[PDB]
Design a protein around this ligand. Sequence first.
Ligand SMILES: OCc1cc(-c2c[nH]nc2-c2ccc(F)cc2)ccn1
Length: 288
Amino acid sequence: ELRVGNRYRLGRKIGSDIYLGTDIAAGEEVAIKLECVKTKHPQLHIESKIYKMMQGGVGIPTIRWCGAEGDYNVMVMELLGPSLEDLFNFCSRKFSLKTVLLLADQMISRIEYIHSKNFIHRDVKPDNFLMGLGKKGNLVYIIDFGLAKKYRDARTHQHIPYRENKNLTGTARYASINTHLGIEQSRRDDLESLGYVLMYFNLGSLPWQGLKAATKRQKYERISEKKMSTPIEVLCKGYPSEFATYLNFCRSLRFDDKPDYSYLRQLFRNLFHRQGFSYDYVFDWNML
Ligand SMILES: OCc1cc(-c2c[nH]nc2-c2ccc(F)cc2)ccn1
């Protein structure tokens, strides 16, 4: 009887807001996102528009419903599996090289797809990639367009202008050095963030993680400084050279440069082949 859109039965809250739901018409399991209508800065209706523009892309979740009902703005999405962060903790924060490469291949393509649809994600983090369910269990999905920005005109492909003095929009742990410097984010920053996520998977933690400071402000300065002070060769020591090559390539991109996604994917595909890993989708979580 407690429904949203007069169709989706409201279930347990799973994230602080995201709930489990059930489509009463189909019997299908869904995820429900609620935004208090009285919030200071409304984001859900804007985010729904981004999801809608992304529909049809590989690993883009389907948006089933959106609207305002009582005290909330509502968005209903198809139910997906756990996030890569949930899976990483489930695997005791250690992923094998094979799993990192299988993930890298799909994550680069998800980012490329968002960029082909004229947006930058701006919050590339393990928490924002989810595995599918059932038959789509080997498919990596990208979520959360709350911080996404249009970087180019849909018609002309004119890139947004270079701008400085920007607030940190994203997670400090994975932010590109340009983001720390307050430079307007662009295609390169989503890819650089992905490079840190892959190194976080390789290492189990990042060298600028767990830094202590009196305030959030001083904490972000310490993360920024530590990230600046750590050469890519030091960060990637003891891991295949492809991870350093990937990161140097992303840091070398100019503000409005179109990244070579095919080259970056091929670096990791060539390493997968050289390693002699089996061509299956047996991730580390399937070995537990
Ligand atoms: O793992 C179950 C699961 C979680 C999520 C999820 C995790 N963070 N945010 C969402 C979400 C949910 C509904 C929505 F409309 C938009 C975003 C989505 C789908 N399936």
